[PDB]
Design a binder for this molecule. Structure first.
Ligand SMILES: N#CN/C(=N\CCCCCCOc1ccc(Cl)cc1)Nc1ccncc1
Ligand SMILES: N#CN/C(=N\CCCCCCOc1ccc(Cl)cc1)Nc1ccncc1
Lengths: 472, 471
């Protein structure tokens, strides 16, 4: 069973001895620190952590004993606030005397802004605020995935609109392949859910269950996929029978969309001779709602995509759309799911546009780039103490390293406000109390062991919409 | 509760309809295909076998659940209920799979077979690649273990060169990555992969993972000392940084203590506060309880050098037998900001050029150690190499025309020792020819049971550095 007493950085066990004596309050905030190409971030992930890890009765005398035994050996010393954790168990039945205020999930906030704040509600548990820093900072991941996925959606949106004239099927042009590419099962469910904030196409099944029990949707499921092949289902037929494999699969799924990886041996031969000639008759007859999706999986991503399209363009009836861009027959589409991140995605669509190919021809797939190739450095997701009450007197606290002004933190009690021009501003030193701005956009989401404010996954999706999507 | 029927890439649900008819055997393998990472530490599989694969993993509830989810997920019913119902009825929910693997901890050069997977029942031909996704995630404990070990080599070389020994080596790369990872489960897995090479960690979660799935003779596989964060310094007010330092070192006067000293001015705190104001509280400390000074900002190498040059002028510096300068035993340094395998090399090299010994310093790494790693780093890949259809086996493989590096091995594989004592993977079942001695892989899993396991002690012994093997 999970133990919150064991879910922190080791040195934080010794921190209750290091704060100024007569300290009754520790107040900390969380921000995606400004780096003086991601200027706005999607706040998502906190609600999962609150329900799964922080709420209810998270302390028992057993959990205190087990933490005591481990830390004795880990430190080779008795340094462990057993009294402190005992107080929480007896006074609050193991519930955390903590209040967390947060911006609503899905919200797209510029960087340098407070996203949530953490403070203890009991003077005795001043140490508790930063004990749970490690666990809360791990929200850097869903936030980073949601943000990075959304930025890729912006790029897709821009190029789709410019070459097709609309945004039809935009939410299905970036498919989640990264289930095997992540560091664990729990990460998989978390990362996939952050992607579904922006798109509807996923293969990482784990994200479906997470959303259902922690956020919920009106629809049965927030993500979808189609029957598709891997290299094993092709290669198993023997190197001489790739056509037999191709034909078997497209016939098995003759009435639904189907994707077939075609680069096992020679991607350019499979498109030109096999799909293009041998099995062309099984393709042209396919329904509009059930196209063949050809899938290259190797080589230079941009060069391979063009050449694939160029091959298919001469084997199949291509039409020029109203915007002047070339379009495959509706029974034929392409998915590029190899070596795609935000960088390469930009190069492909721009490459496709230069060659007059429409983005409606292609959807993308991303694995490690989508879910794993991300760090806390990217958005500078940081958790810092800004306000402390000692001897009844409150002071504004901050860090400001001489050799890195970028790492400077904010002072005092914070609040998030809408500017007169409709932008965002973070007020420091408790200046938000002056009422010179609107109401604090942060909402109490957690207090004294109970989640006080929840958001459906439907709301989070609505909040994180792109601007061009609102413009429709 | 976990459900293995829901723990695979979606499209694999449709794969049982794609293999050649009358296929009875699907046999697949795993490899680190193809800064250089020429050899990898195999570690992590045993966790996945125990936590996720062994025992009754299939029930009538889990089948119905997967039935319901996939129906909405595909907007159609393509889920193989009959196949999973066969497992439940015939084997009481136990997976008819056999997995052979190189012993955990082993350091194997790239391009070799690390483990293989195959079905043990003709009916469950489709089962082999169903569990691809879950098994491929071993890429992460393997990569962390490998990258952590590679960094250990770097520290070993420069420590031995500047100090003459390897004392304190397994404590010179501390885990700070707990907050820097994507989840709790990852933290435990990543930290345990780190603990294969080192003993210094702050990621608590890894300790319990090891005890449950691997086990050690010692109570714990990892250790830590009391230390400060920015909040325990800055909470005293900017005008009272000296008061915080003094309070902290006084609380932990008899145990090792580390104090982050860059809240405002790293070079001021080192020269004026530690070096003048509180100098009397430092030189009195025990050799078993040194003050550890922790910078946490600026250019990593430049900061470390200037810090050391400052302390060397405020404190009695000694020159060891190898001619390298050394702080007094009650004073050390830890650099835990911006440290990865690349920067770690630059720092120790920069220290050596400035005649500073590596014994003066330990390192802390967070994202670089646990998070900034991907599956393509060691090209960790899982591929089918052998199937039996119509009673006839065939050697299958991929070979993309535009990428020879994605070529996959053919036929039944085996791992052998070369006459010169190296590793070789034999393909096309040529291991049966007995020309290369016995197969080095062991059956670790069969029909729902872990059949061979290793202690964390064995793994550590297996993962030792050749320099450590020398004496
Ligand atoms: N193609 C492939 N691959 C794959 N699944 C199939 C993805 C299907 C994407 C099809 C295009 O978008 C759509 C997604 C959903 C819907 Cl309703 C319609 C269209 N899964 C992998 C591959 C590689 N690694 C892991 C999983
Ligand atoms: N100090 C710090 N950091 C921290 N706690 C304590 C870790 C223990 C470090 C022990 C270092 O022993 C040494 C050993 C040998 C030498 Cl020559 C110098 C030092 N944990 C963090 C920090 C930042 N972020 C996450 C965790």
């Amino acid at each position: 069973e999970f133990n919150i007493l064991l879910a922190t950085d080791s040195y934080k066990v010794t921190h209750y001895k290091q704060y100024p004596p007569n300290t009754s309050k520790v107040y900390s905030y969380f921000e995606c620190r400004e780096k003086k190409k991601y200027e706005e971030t999607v706040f998502y992930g906190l609600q999962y952590i609150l329900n799964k890890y922080l709420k209810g009765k998270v302390v028992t005398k057993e959990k205190i004993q087990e933490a005591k035994d481990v830390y004795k050996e880990h430190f080779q010393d008795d340094v462990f606030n057993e009294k402190g954790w005992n107080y929480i168990l007896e006074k609050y039945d193991g519930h955390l005397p903590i209040e967390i205020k947060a911006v609503p999930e899905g919200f797209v906030i510029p960087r340098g802004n407070v996203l949530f704040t953490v403070e203890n509600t009991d003077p005795e548990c001043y140490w508790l605020t930063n004990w749970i820093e490690t666990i809360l900072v791990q929200s850097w991941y869903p936030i980073t995935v949601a943000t990075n996925s959304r930025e890729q959606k912006k790029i897709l949106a821009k190029y789709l609109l410019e070459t097709s004239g609309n945004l039809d099927g935009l939410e299905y042009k970036l498919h989640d392949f990264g289930y095997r590419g992540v560091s664990s099962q729990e990460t998989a469910g978390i990362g996939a859910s952050a992607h579904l904030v922006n798109f509807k196409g996923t293969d990482t099944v784990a994200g479906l269950a997470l959303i259902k029990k922690y956020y919920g949707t009106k629809d049965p499921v927030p993500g979808y996929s189609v029957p598709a092949a891997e290299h094993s289902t092709i290669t198993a037929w023997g190197k001489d029978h790739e056509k037999d494999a191709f034909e078997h699969i497209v016939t098995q799924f003759s009435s639904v969309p189907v994707s077939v990886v075609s680069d096992s041996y020679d991607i350019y031969n499979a498109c030109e001779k096999i799909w293009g000639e041998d099995l062309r008759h099984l393709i042209v007859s396919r329904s509009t709602q059930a196209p063949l999706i050809i899938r290259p999986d190797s080589g230079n991503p941009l060069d391979t995509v063009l050449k694939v399209l160029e091959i298919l363009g001469k084997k199949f009836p291509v039409t020029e759309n109203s915007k002047g861009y070339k379009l495959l027959p509706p029974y034929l589409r392409v998915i590029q799911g190899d070596g795609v991140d935000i960088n390469t995605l930009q190069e492909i669509v721009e490459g496709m546009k230069q060659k007059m190919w429409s983005i409606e021809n292609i959807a993308f797939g991303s694995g490690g780039g989508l879910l794993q190739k991300l760090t806390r450095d990217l958005l500078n997701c940081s958790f810092k103490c800004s306000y402390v009450v000692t001897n009844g007197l409150g002071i504004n606290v901050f860090k400001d390293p001489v050799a890195d002004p970028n790492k400077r933190s904010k002072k005092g009690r914070l609040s998030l406000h809408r500017t007169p021009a409709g932008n965002f501003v973070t007020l420091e030193e408790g200046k938000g109390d002056l009422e010179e701005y609107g109401q604090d956009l942060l909402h109490t989401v957690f207090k004294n062991g109970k989640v006080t404010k929840s958001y459906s996954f439907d709301e989070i999706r609505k909040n994180a919409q792109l601007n061009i999507e609102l413009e429709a």
